[PDB]
Amino acid sequence: GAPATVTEQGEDITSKKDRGVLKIVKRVGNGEETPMIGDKVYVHYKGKLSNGKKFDSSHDRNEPFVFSLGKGQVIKAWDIGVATMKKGEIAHLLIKPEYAYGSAGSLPKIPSNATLFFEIELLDFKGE
Template sequence: MKEFNSMKVVKALLIFGMIALAMSGCKKDDVYDAEEQFIRDTTLIEQFLDQNNLVAQTHSSGLRYIITSEGEGPNAAFGNSVEVKFTGYLLDGTEFDTNEGQGDFFFVVDRGDVIRGWDIGFKLLNKGATATLFIPSTLGFGNTARTKIPANSVVVFDVRVLSIR
C-alpha cells in the first residue's frame, strides 16, 4: 500500500514539474508585439538605406522600395497574374531564394499566394519594371523562422516583372 502512495506522489511531482516547466516559457517578455517589431524593422531598413546611400520611397504600409527601371503599361492590380524573376536576401546580404536561371514564378495579386509585402510591392510596378523591395517582417515571414530566414527578419527582394495578365 505504501508503494502505491509513493507512486502517486512521484506522479504528482512529475506532473507539477512539467506544468512549472511549461509555464516558465510563457513569460510576458516572450509575447510577440507586431507594432514593436514593425518599429524595429523600419529602423533597421532606414539604417541600411543610410549606410548604403540608398534613397527609397515609402509605401503607407511601411514597405520601402526603389524602382530601378520603369516598365510600361498599367501596374499590377488585384487579381492579376504576375510573372516575375526574383532574388531574396536578408539585410546582411545572405541570399535565401532566387529563381534566376530557373523557371519563372507566377502568382495572383492579393490571393494570399505570397507574402503581403509582395502583394503591396508588385501593385507599384508594371510590366518590365525592376525594383528592390525592403519588406518589414510584419509584411514578410513574421515571427516564424523559415529555412534560411530567421524569425522577425527584414527581407529584401530584387524583382523584375516579366508579365502581368
C-alpha cells in the same frame, strides 16, 4: 545588391504608412499599366536576408515565378509591391518582418524578425 547601411532609402508603399515595404525603382518599366488584384503576374526575382546569409532567385531555375496578385500566395510585401509595378519595371524592396515572416520566422530558412531585400522584374500579367 544590398540595402543602404545607415538610412532607409525607398518610398513607403504600404496602405498603413508603417514604413514596412520601401521601394526603389532600379529600371523604369515600358508598360503604362499596373496589375490589378486577381491578375496572374509573371516575375523574375532575387531575394536575400538583408544581411546576405541566404539567397534565392528565379534565375537559378531559369523559371519565372507566377502568382495571383493579392491572394496571399506570397508574403504580404510582394502583393503590395508588385501591385505598384509596370511591365518591364525592376524594383528593389526592403521588407520589414510584418510584411514577410514576422516574429515567428520560418526556420531553417528565415529567422525571427528578419528584414528581407528583393529585386523583382515584372515580366507580364493578365486578368484571371
